[PDB]
Ligand SMILES: [Ca+2]
Ligand SMILES: [Ca+2]
């Protein structure tokens with residue numbers, strides 16, 4: 001479950017990436033329903049994912065990305081984590097900021 005999203009969508013999205021290395025963030029964003037949320041709602045999601053409230057989603061939080069949807073969900077592999085980072089880190093500082101997060105989700 002995730003605030004603002006349908007439990008059925010979140011559960012199906014988690015099932016869709018059950019296999020190691022099958023996680024594709026853009027497919028996950030669409031399946032879970034975040035890609036269809038308003039920009040304002042996408043920003044809310046960001047602050048939840050930013051676990052230590054540093055203002056940025058760092059690699060360690062990216063690795064445990066799925067835990068925000070279910071505490072028992074698997075960690076992303078180092079390969080999945082790095083691809084996630086490479087796709088969203090538009091300014092090259094090694095982390096994902098709120099605007100980068102929103103850009104990655106809204107096409
Ligand atoms: Ca953080
Ligand atoms: Ca960045």
Ligand SMILES: [N+]
Nearest residue numbers: 052058060061
């Ligand atoms: N972090």
